Amino acid sequence: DALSLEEILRLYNQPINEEQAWAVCYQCCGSLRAAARRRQPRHRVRSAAQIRVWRDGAVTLAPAADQCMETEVIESLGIIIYKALDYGLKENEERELSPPLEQLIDHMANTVEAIRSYRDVMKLCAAHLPTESDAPNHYQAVCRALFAETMELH
């Protein structure tokens, strides 16, 4: 009923595509934003195991095998996302990321030459679309589908 992003990465044994990153990012903060709104303990994104992907097409961060501020969660999330977008490459090689995406990840994880809150992140994910107002439906579908298609592999 929910696949961890790490299960999805093992079954396909390949990286998520750009869009899927944009999705997981949006979906995921959207869940974090709505958990801080109920004032819930903030968890760091340790590994892609914690990123539960839902049938209905939500993405929610789990608590890890185990203070800490918002900007930190954003960052640790951005990192897993990079790492996922990275699956199965060696050291010498890194993936050509489409600039607005590099630019998103670099900003979430502090790798640049602003973004202080989950909200900020979504405004950016949503900016990636031809119509800004489409985000919450598109990024559902996208994830909804990444679940469906992964269950087809079993």
UniProtKB/Swiss-Prot annotation:
Residues 79-86 are annotated as: Important for interaction with FMN2. It is found in: Cytoplasm, Cytoskeleton; Cytoplasm, Perinuclear region; Cell membrane; Cytoplasmic vesicle membrane. Residues 3-153 form the KIND domain. Acts as an actin nucleation factor, remains associated with the slow-growing pointed end of the new filament. Involved in intracellular vesicle transport along actin fibers, providing a novel link between actin cytoskeleton dynamics and intracellular transport. Required for asymmetric spindle positioning and asymmetric cell division during meiosis. Required for normal formation of the cleavage furrow and for polar body extrusion during female germ cell meiosis. Belongs to the spire family. Binds to actin monomers via the WH2 domain. The Spir-box targets binding to intracellular membrane structures. Interacts with FMN2. (Microbial infection) Interacts (via C-terminus) with vaccinia virus protein K7/OPG41; this interaction prevents innate immune signaling activation. This is Protein spire homolog 1. It comes from Homo sapiens (Human).
